[PDB]
């Protein structure tokens, strides 16, 4: 697999280089979202965790369509404050419970090195 640790101080630079095939080699789940919350990249691990087919969920909206349980102050709200502000670096625990067995995970949200995109990283706790 590709060699990146979850929570890494420099991780948005490491991932800048990665295409989707290479994203699927991470030991953790990775979503790339535009400033409107639309999914642009969605890695195999995230599929293993949540049970979605990444190919199919690219292009859908994370907060409206795919993961409405994250539509709340304590996830989306933090997401949008960061898009509003041009800056976003937060880590927290959450339970994913929409159309799946309830699964507690660690979420890390970080502004990408790209122009207007943001990362969401996920792993089991």
Swiss-Prot record:
Protein encoded by which gene: pyp
Q: Name one GO molecular function term.
A: identical protein binding
Gene3D superfamilies for this protein: PAS domain
Q: How is it modified after translation?
A: The 4-hydroxycinnamic acid (p-coumaric acid) chromophore is covalently bound via a thioester linkage.
The cross-references to PROSITE patterns, in alphabetical order and at most eight, read:
PAS
PAS domain: which residues?
23-86
One GO BP on record is:
phototransduction
What SUPFAM superfamilies does the annotation carry?
PYP-like sensor domain (PAS domain) (SSF55785)
- Which residues, renumbered to this chain, carry the PTM S-(4-hydroxycinnamyl)cysteine? 69
Q: Which UniProt keywords apply?
A: Chromophore, Photoreceptor protein, Receptor, Sensory transduction
Q: How does it assemble?
A: Monomer.
Family classification: Belongs to the photoactive yellow protein family.
- Asked if the record carries the keyword Zinc-finger, the reply is no
Please list every transmembrane segment annotated in the UniProt record, as residue ranges. none
What's this protein's name? Photoactive yellow protein
This molecule's function is given as: Photoactive blue light protein. Probably functions as a photoreceptor for a negative phototaxis response.
């Amino acid at each position: 697999m590709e060699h990146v640790a979850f929570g890494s101080e420099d991780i948005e630079n490491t991932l800048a280089k990665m295409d989707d095939g290479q994203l699927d080699g991470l030991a953790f789940g990775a979503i790339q979202l535009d400033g409107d919350g639309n999914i642009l990249q969605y890695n195999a691990a995230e599929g293993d965790i949540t049970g979605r087919d990444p190919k199919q969920v690219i292009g859908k909206n994370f907060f409206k369509d795919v993961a409405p349980c994250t539509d709340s102050p304590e996830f989306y709200g933090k997401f949008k404050e960061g898009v509003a502000s041009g800056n976003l670096n937060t880590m927290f625990e959450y339970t994913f419970d929409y159309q799946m067995t309830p699964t507690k995970v660690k979420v890390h949200m970080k502004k990408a090195l790209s122009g207007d995109s943001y990362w969401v990283f996920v792993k089991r706790v």
